[PDB]
Ligand binder design. Sequence first.
Ligand SMILES: [Mg+2]
Ligand SMILES: [Mg+2]
Lengths: 130, 131
Amino acid sequence: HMKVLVAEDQSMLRDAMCQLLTLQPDVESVLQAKNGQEAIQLLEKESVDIAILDVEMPVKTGLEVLEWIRSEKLETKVVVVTTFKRAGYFERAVKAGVDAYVLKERSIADLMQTLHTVLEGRKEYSPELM
Amino acid sequence: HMKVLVAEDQSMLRDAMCQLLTLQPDVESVLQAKNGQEAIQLLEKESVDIAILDVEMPVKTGLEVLEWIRSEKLETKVVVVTTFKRAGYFERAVKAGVDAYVLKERSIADLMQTLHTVLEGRKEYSPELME
Ligand SMILES: [Mg+2]
Ligand SMILES: [Mg+2]
C-alpha cells in the first residue's frame, strides 16, 4: 500500500534504500529525490504516505523539508534519517512533529518497523540520537 | 486484559482517572496508590501489567518508584505522568528505562494508546516533556 518518498543526496545510499523498499511486499511505489529541493517539487504535485528524509542535503535540508511539510499541513508521515548525533537537529525535528528520527544505517527490517510504526500513528526515536 | 496500578497523590485526580480507566473494556482492574510508598507495597503483592505513576508524590516520587521497579526487575511497564517540564526528569526517567513519559492532562483515548504502546514494548514521550 505505502507510497514512499526517499530524499538522500549520496547516490549509492539513495539507491540501496529505494531498491530495498521497492522490493518490499508492503510498498506500492518509491519516489526519489537527490536533495531537499527535488523532494519539495515532487511533494508539490504528488501524493505520499511517508517521506523518508536525510538531514544533511544540498539546497534544502531534511529538517527544512520536514518544516515545509508541516507548514503545508500534508497527510504525510515524515521519517528523518541521519548518521551523526551532532545536532540540535533533534529538538528542531521534534519541534516540527517529526514522526520518527532514526539511524540511517539500519536493517531494512528495522526501517519497515519504523514505516509501519508511523503509519499506525506512533513515533519512533533511535535512542542513540536522543 | 490490563491489570493497572495508578499512583496519584491528588485525590480527585486519582478517582477520576481510575474510574475512567475501569470503564474501558480493555482495562480489567486498577489498583490505587495515594503516594510512591503505597505504590511499591501494592507492586510487591499483586501482579500488575502497567503502572501509571505521578512524578510529584510525597514520601516516594514516581521516579523513585520507577527505579525500584527496575532494581527489582519486575515485569511491569511504567508510564510516568506529569504536567511540568522539570530539568533533569526526562533524562532520569529515560535512564531507568521508562516505557512512557507523557502529560497527565490528556484524553483517556490518548492514555489508552500509551497503555497499548508500552505493552507491545514501544516507547511514547510527550514532545512537551522531551529534553
Ligand atoms: Mg546526506
Ligand atoms: Mg502531583
